[PDB]
Amino acid sequence: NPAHDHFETFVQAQLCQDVLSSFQGLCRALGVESGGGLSQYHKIKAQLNYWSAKSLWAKLDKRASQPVYQQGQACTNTKCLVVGAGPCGLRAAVELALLGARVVLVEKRIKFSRHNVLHLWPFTIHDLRALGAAAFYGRTLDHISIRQLQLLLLKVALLLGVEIHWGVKFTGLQPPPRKGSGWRAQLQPNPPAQLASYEFDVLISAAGGKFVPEGFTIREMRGKLAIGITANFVNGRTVEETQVPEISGVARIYNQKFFQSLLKATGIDLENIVYYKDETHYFVMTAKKQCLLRLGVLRQDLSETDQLLGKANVVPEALQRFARAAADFATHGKLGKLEFAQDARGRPDVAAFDFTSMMRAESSARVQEKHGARLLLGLVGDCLVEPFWPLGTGVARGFLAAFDAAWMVKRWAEGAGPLEVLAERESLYQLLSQTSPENMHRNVAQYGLDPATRYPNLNLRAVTPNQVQDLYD
Numbered sequence: 001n002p003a004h005d006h007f008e009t010f011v012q013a014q015l016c017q018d019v020l021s022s023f024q025g026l027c028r029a030l031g032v033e034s035g036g037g038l039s040q041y042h043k044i045k046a047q048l049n050y051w052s053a054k055s056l057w058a059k060l061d062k063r064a065s066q067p068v069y070q071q072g073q074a075c076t077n078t079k080c081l082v083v084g085a086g087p088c089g090l091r092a093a094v095e096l097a098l099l100g101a102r103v104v105l106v107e108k109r110i111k112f113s114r115h116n117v118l119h120l121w122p123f124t125i126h127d128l129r130a131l132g133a134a135a136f137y138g139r140t141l142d143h144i145s146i147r148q149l150q151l152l153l154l155k156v157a158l159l160l161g162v163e164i165h166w167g168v169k170f171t172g173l174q175p176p177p178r179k180g181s182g183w184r185a186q187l188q189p190n191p192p193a194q195l196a197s198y199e200f201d202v203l204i205s206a207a208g209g210k211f212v213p214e215g216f217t218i219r220e221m222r223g224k225l226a227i228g229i230t231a232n233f234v235n236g237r238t239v240e241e242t243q244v245p246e247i248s249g250v251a252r253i254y255n256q257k258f259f260q261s262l263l264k265a266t267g268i269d270l271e272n273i274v275y276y277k278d279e280t281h282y283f284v285m286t287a288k289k290q291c292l293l294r295l296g297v298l299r300q301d302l303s304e305t306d307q308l309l310g311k312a313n314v315v316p317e318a319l320q321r322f323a324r325a326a327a328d329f330a331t332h333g334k335l336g337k338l339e340f341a342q343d344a345r346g347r348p349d350v351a352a353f354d355f356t357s358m359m360r361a362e363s364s365a366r367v368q369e370k371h372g373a374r375l376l377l378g379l380v381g382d383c384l385v386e387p388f389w390p391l392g393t394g395v396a397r398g399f400l401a402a403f404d405a406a407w408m409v410k411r412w413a414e415g416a417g418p419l420e421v422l423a424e425r426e427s428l429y430q431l432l433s434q435t436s437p438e439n440m441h442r443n444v445a446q447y448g449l450d451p452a453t454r455y456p457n458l459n460l461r462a463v464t465p466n467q468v469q470d471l472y473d
């Protein structure tokens, strides 16, 4: 059955292009238009009540029917543009969809190429499971690679009728030229008329570490130099490979004299290491600069980290030897001969990163108004709070920011004043950089958009309308 086959292909799909073609073939076969909101979702499921698909819709329905969404009517007025199909962009898109809003998302890339592996807090694991994650991804389960989290959330966003455009870069805004017009987006390359003319009152920016819209202030604090190295090796799925335990973190304190043993044998002095067994064997480690220079990884000692870890300063062969030697030792050689996975552009998949300079945006939202047309803008994900990767806070905190932005859009749609919406968002924002599974609500099954289910003794007035006046205009 060819609607069934397209749906089956869509579910099982493992390349961004393959998700898109099978989903389009599904829409064609069922006579529906993609990007058609919750109505699309209802029409698709009504045609696919066939048992195999049944538990998928039962989970998505159970989510959609949560009181907070008002059955897809809360934001039925609202038209959003989401920048970025990273995990946190798709996740915010899905919450916006379930609220009833029209949602268009633009992504500069045309594939999901990142293999690095991300740690998941308990709440996010339940969150994903609750979204049909088991039907979408066959494959311990406390971590997930970037691209598989993207494929999963892409298929959810698509079913829920989010309209997504690829190989399009958000470059800023076209303000209302006068009374009666809305906000539009500047886009590269020169967009088709459909996107050129799309007007929205909500912009959610989830463009990652290196982009926020004009008007946002970012805070950069630079601490003690830390240099991170990530590597992905091919994971054949040999029984032997499968039996090698993961290494949850190690470090000084923690699980220490391991680093004693590593240095002798190898000459590698590390601050931390982590091994995740996933689609690849992934390692992340923090290495002393002295040590990277001593072992030929960095070719000289530059004071500016962005130069220190630049292409010109990093030696590919030395970097590869270092990471393989470290990975082999941590695993006691039981992974066999390690082969580097071959990377977004065909290179061996190892790299060095600035683990030191940690941005935090000054606000999570702003409002811009012109000729009587208001635009609400919200940041979500790495562009709001940059994560320190070995501590595993990226997904968790990007997802919380996505719920908190969606809650704010709910409020916006309900008619609260811009200052009221902004002050309440910013009271939530004050908690973000200290959140932990320990200081949040413990029953993660009951987490939903309403922040009271997520943050205990919540204070939505921590920030006042006057404290946010400079965020409005």
Ligand SMILES: Cc1cc2nc3c(=O)[nH]c(=O)nc-3n(C[C@H](O)[C@H](O)[C@H](O)COP(=O)(O)OP(=O)(O)OC[C@H]3O[C@@H](n4cnc5c(N)ncnc54)[C@H](O)[C@@H]3O)c2cc1C
Binding pocket: 083, 084, 085, 086, 087, 088, 089, 106, 107, 108, 109, 114, 116, 117, 118, 119, 146, 168, 169, 170, 171, 206, 207, 208, 209, 211, 230, 284, 380, 381, 382, 383, 387, 388, 389, 390, 392, 394, 395, 398
């Ligand atoms: C090279 C790389 C490696 C990483 N490795 C790790 C790791 O090993 N461990 C870990 O914990 N975290 C890692 N991270 C961070 C981790 O991926 C993020 O915490 C997580 O994906 C959530 O990020 P996000 O959705 O906010 O942003 P991202 O994942 O950065 O996604 C941003 C999305 O926006 C798109 N985009 C950017 N600019 C525009 C524009 N102007 N218009 C349209 N689209 C745009 C990007 O193409 C991207 O698809 C890595 C990030 C990168 C970029």
